[PDB]
From TrEMBL:
SUPFAM superfamilies: Tubulin C-terminal domain-like (SSF55307), Tubulin nucleotide-binding domain-like (SSF52490). It is found in: Cytoplasm, Cytoskeleton. Belongs to the tubulin family. Its main location: cytoplasm. Dimer of alpha and beta chains. A typical microtubule is a hollow water-filled tube with an outer diameter of 25 nm and an inner diameter of 15 nM. Alpha-beta heterodimers associate head-to-tail to form protofilaments running lengthwise along the microtubule wall with the beta-tubulin subunit facing the microtubule plus end conferring a structural polarity. Microtubules usually have 13 protofilaments but different protofilament numbers can be found in some organisms and specialized cells. Keywords: Calcium, Cytoplasm, Cytoskeleton, GTP-binding, Hydrolase, Metal-binding, Microtubule, Nucleotide-binding. SMART domains: Tubulin (SM00864), Tubulin_C (SM00865). The keyword Metal-binding applies. GO terms for biological process: adult locomotory behavior; cellular response to calcium ion; centrosome cycle; cerebellar cortex morphogenesis; cerebral cortex development; dentate gyrus development; flagellated sperm motility; forebrain morphogenesis. This is Tubulin alpha chain. GO terms for molecular function: GTP binding; hydrolase activity; identical protein binding; metal ion binding; protein heterodimerization activity; protein-containing complex binding; structural constituent of cytoskeleton. Mg(2+) 3 binds at D95. It catalyses: GTP + H2O = GDP + phosphate + H(+).
Length: 434
């Protein structure tokens, strides 16, 4: 059984959600109408993410929420209009206008009950609900504010359930708001005690990979989201194919998060090959494993040689021989600039999914024989928190834009409480890093 419910909040959450469910369907052989031919055993491993109707229709265990309707209307009328039921696609009338306070307080309060009601309808269809996967931006008023309100409400209504995040970290090369450093700090503060594990996706890292490895001069959100979905699928594959590592949401915390507040693992993916380049000699297990320690392949911009490891998981997919993985890991424990923290076990956890990696037809990514996603909890990711905090500090010293938040419910003191919590988080990393 062991079901997982995916929640996509705001434009970034919804659009990445579109790319993910398209890829999940292709991986599991589900058509855009929800029908599936072959399968054969209920006993289908993908039933953790897809419910099955009496007609044999495979329905994603997903909720899509936005405070304005334009993005979700495209889902309602697009290629996957028959995949999701209309009740799973929830929209408001007025967005949060890049304001956390509107998303969380004034506008978010109007749709929270309806969203929770729809989540409850999906939870009732579960016989062993594991928990939730939450997709959202840090920068958006909805992505930041509404997500933190929903995370707070889910911790009360489903106390025993695990909650994982896929968070879109802001970048000037891909940006929408001047106020995004405020929204980022505000959502991090209010979500920190309600999230078990969060995968940050730095828009600059994704932008750099698309330009450097996919030879895309100016990447659109489509280009960025197809790369993000490929990495998200690599992380959730274990939950959809019944492997040996990260088989349940609880295991993500057990394997990657020894210190509860320090729950931000760095994802590194390989190989990223352009579809529009005539392939070459296929990359070996050792080559794709070595690429996991190449900073250029990270989902977050940071220097892991400056940091220390708390945990490390390697998730292989495709034509991967276990002895070849063991030899690749043995080399990493030798040629070691891999320093683990004081009281952590020092081992690498390994998972192998033998299905050939799947890519979107008409996508930018080339089909490969073998791929790997490394999930490492490193103190080097604190560099990303420091960048946000510095931007927050510059504006907050002058109280620039704070009037917008104060006029939308929010107390000025919340800005100081949030920033102090970020200062304590930076100190947590610093204490572990020595
Ligand atoms: N990777 C990625 N980032 C996106 C996408 N759409 C928007 N963003 C980023 O998300 C941030 C803006 O947040 P949004 O998700 O667009 O907005 P929202 O959450 O709907 O909130 P409001 O519209 O302000 O109510 C910026 O950092 C954008 O770069 C997308 O499809 N992919
Ligand atoms: Mg929007």
């Amino acid at each position: 059984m062991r079901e997982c419910i995916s929640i996509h909040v705001g434009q970034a959450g919804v659009q990445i959600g579109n790319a993910c469910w398209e890829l999940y369907c292709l991986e599991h052989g589900i058509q855009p109408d929800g029908q599936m031919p072959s399968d054969k055993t209920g006993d289908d491993s993908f039933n953790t993410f897809f419910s099955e109707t009496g007609a044999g229709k495979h329905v994603p265990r997903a909720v899509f929420v936005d405070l304005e309707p334009t993005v979700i209307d495209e889902v309602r009328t697009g290629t996957y209009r028959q995949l999701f039921h209309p009740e799973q696609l929830i929209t408001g009338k007025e967005d949060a206008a890049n304001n956390y306070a509107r998303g969380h307080y004034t506008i978010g309060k109007e749709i929270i009950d309806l969203v929770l009601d729809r989540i409850r309808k999906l939870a009732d269809q579960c016989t062993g609900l594991q928990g939730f996967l939450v997709f959202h931006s840090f920068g958006g008023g909805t992505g930041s504010g509404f997500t933190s309100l929903l995370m707070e409400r889910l911790s009360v209504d489903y106390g025993k359930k695990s909650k994982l995040e896929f968070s879109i970290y802001p970048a000037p090369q891909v940006s929408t708001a001047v106020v995004e450093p405020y929204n980022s700090i505000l959502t991090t503060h209010t979500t920190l005690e309600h999230s078990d594990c969060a995968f940050m996706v730095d828009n600059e890292a994704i932008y750099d990979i698309c330009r450097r490895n996919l030879d895309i001069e100016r990447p659109t959100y489509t280009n960025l989201n197809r790369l993000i979905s490929q990495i998200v699928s690599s992380i959730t594959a274990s939950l959809r194919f019944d492997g040996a590592l990260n088989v349940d949401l609880t295991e993500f915390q057990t394997n990657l998060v020894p210190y509860p507040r320090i729950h931000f693992p760095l994802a590194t993916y390989a190989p990223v090959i352009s579809a529009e380049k005539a392939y070459h000699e296929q990359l070996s297990v050792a080559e794709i494993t070595n690429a996991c320690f190449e900073p250029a392949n990270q989902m977050v911009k940071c220097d892991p040689r400056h940091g220390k490891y708390m945990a490390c998981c390697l998730l292989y997919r495709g034509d991967v021989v276990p002895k070849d993985v063991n030899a690749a890991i043995a080399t990493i424990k030798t040629k070691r600039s891999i320093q683990f923290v004081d009281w952590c076990p020092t081992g690498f956890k390994v998972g192998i999914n033998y299905q050939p990696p799947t890519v979107v037809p008409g996508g930018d990514l080339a089909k490969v024989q073998r791929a790997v996603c490394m999930l490492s909890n490193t103190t080097a990711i604190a560099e990303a928190w420091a960048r946000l905090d510095h931007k927050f500090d510059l504006m907050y010293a002058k109280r620039a834009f704070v009037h917008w938040y104060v006029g939308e419910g929010m107390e000025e003191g919340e800005f100081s409480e949030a920033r102090e919590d970020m200062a304590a988080l930076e100190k947590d990393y610093e204490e572990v890093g020595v």
